[PDB]
From a paper:
Gene-deletion and transgenic studies in mice established that Grb10 and Grb14 are tissue-specific, negative regulators of insulin action. Previous structural and biochemical studies of Grb14 established that: (i) the BPS region inhibits the catalytic activity of the insulin receptor by binding as a pseudosubstrate in the kinase active site; (ii) the SH2 domain binds directly to the phosphorylated activation loop of the insulin receptor kinase domain; and (iii) functional RA and PH domains are required for negative regulation of the insulin receptor. The small GTPases N-Ras, H-Ras, and K-Ras serve as molecular switches in cellular growth control, cycling between a GDP-bound inactive state and a GTP-bound active state, and gain-of-function mutations in the Ras proteins are found in approximately 30% of human cancers. To understand the molecular basis for the interaction of Grb14 with activated Ras, we determined the crystal structure of the Grb14 RA and PH domains in complex with activated H-Ras and measured the in vitro binding affinity of this interaction.
We determined the crystal structure of a complex between Grb14 RA-PH (Grb14RA-PH) and a constitutively active mutant (G12V) of H-Ras loaded with Mg-GTP. The four copies of Grb14RA-PH-Ras in the asymmetric unit are highly similar and superimpose on one another with a root-mean-square deviation (rmsd) of <1 Å (410 Cα atoms). As first observed in the Grb10RA-PH structure, and more recently in the RIAM and lamellipodin RA-PH structures, the RA and PH domains of Grb14, together with the intervening linker of ~40 residues, share an extensive interaction interface, which creates an integrated two-domain structural unit. Despite low sequence identity (<20%), the Grb14 RA domain adopts the same ubiquitin-like fold of the RA domains (RBDs) of RalGDS and Raf1, consisting of a five-stranded β sheet and two α helices. The PH domain adopts the canonical PH-domain fold, comprising a seven-stranded β sheet and a C-terminal α helix. Grb14RA-PH interacts with GTP-loaded H-Ras (G12V) exclusively via the RA domain, with the β1-β2 loop of the PH domain free to bind to the headgroup of membrane phosphoinositides. A common feature of RA-domain binding to activated Ras is backbone hydrogen-bonding between β2 of the RA domain and β2 in the switch 1 region of Ras. Specifically, Lys111 (β1) of Grb14RA-PH is salt-bridged to Glu37 (switch 1) of Ras, Arg120 (β2) is salt-bridged to Asp38 (switch 1), Asp123 (β2) is hydrogen-bonded to Tyr64 (switch 2), and Lys140 (α1) is salt-bridged to Asp33 (switch 1). A small hydrophobic cluster is formed between residues Val109 (β1) and Ala121 (β2) of Grb14RA-PH and Ile36 (switch 1), Tyr64 (switch 2), and Met67 (switch 2) of Ras. Mg-GTP is bound canonically to Ras in the Grb14RA-PH-Ras structure.
Numbering used by the authors:
A (entry chain A): 106 to 211, 219 to 356
B (entry chain B): -4 to 166
Amino acid sequence: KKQVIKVYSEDETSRALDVPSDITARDVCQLLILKNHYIDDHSWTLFEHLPHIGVERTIEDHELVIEVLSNWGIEEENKLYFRKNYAKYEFFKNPMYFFPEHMVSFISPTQILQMFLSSSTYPEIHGFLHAKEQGKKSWKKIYFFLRRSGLYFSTKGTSAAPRHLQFFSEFGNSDIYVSLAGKKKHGAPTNYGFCFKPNKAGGPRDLKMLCAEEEQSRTCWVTAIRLLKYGMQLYQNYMHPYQG
Amino acid sequence: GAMGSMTEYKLVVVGAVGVGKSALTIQLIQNHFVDEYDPTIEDSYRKQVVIDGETCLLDILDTAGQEEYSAMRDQYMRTGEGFLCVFAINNTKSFEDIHQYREQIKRVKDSDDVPMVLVGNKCDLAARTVESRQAQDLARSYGIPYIETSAKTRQGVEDAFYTLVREIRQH
Ligand SMILES: Nc1nc2c(ncn2[C@@H]2O[C@H](COP(=O)(O)OP(=O)(O)OP(=O)(O)O)[C@@H](O)[C@H]2O)c(=O)[nH]1
């Protein structure tokens, strides 16, 4: 059970690795730290990079890299990259003030931490975002709610009443990506885009595209979405950098 | 600002296990010698150099000697423009393997005129099992140059790679 994979650097050079099919992102990073004579920072990261749509995401430590590769279309020319990422576990280091005052609800550090990582309750994340309404090239500014069951927007201002809520996306079977330095100008209001791509083991894998007002607003959203999707596992990854 | 023209060259370093393919490549790119042995599957390298008054980007593919990975050979041979054919001068087995590489390239690319340099590496050693003249012949036989190198000493590293580029350019 082995697969040869290619991992790229920023300079667009690459190294091939023949790895067992059950290998994690953590284990590939550690392999590459050793082979390249680097020093383990804990910031080394494998990224899933989708060049045709201009987005990338951090591959979480525990994910199986071959399962990530399996969800690729064969004409897509997707790539794995290896570089440092300092923001990855920023919420875990400085939790109590990570999220802005108005954006969350359910102040102590491990209070907020425990509320975000529970498998029962999720907090609520709410704020404006720009969304590309489906099939159309235009974008609208709308109020959104992130909850345990997923992401919703209000058809009427900021109103959280069930009457006004519209389901936008699940994250059980979607992955979260952040846009690189590519053309926003497929309509987008800013360069701070992010998007959800369904697993191929769903139905049609249409991109749900979003866009924040500010970089920092995106980071909070993507972080909230990550914590909701992976929950306690994210924290375990961070708290056990070597797992063994 | 200003537009800047640049030509790229796709070089591929081929040869049996442990002949010094990576040590030579790393010496070229990174100006230092790797004493340890680190099995290669397929590693890619980039270097901007000026050759004969022209600005070039060398994309260098450092490949596997391991037969376990021979299925990958066909892709890098179609894609490659120039091939550095390396054997070690203290290893006769390696010298016989390079015949097969030359032939696989000849066939995959479908041409008798593929840019190539035969490289006799590890020239810094006392225990020669392949004589210079022996390889001088096989080179003449192919019509390609022969350059002896040492990754350990840096002897003929730049020579070998820049010659291949010149072979590419003249073809
Ligand atoms: N004395 C001497 N040793 C060398 C020279 N070049 C490489 N070596 C040594 O031989 C061993 C193998 O060299 P590599 O470059 O790793 O061999 P390779 O041909 O790339 O092997 P694969 O990647 O498996 O194809 C290493 O220990 C090197 O230090 C040289 O010019 N002189």
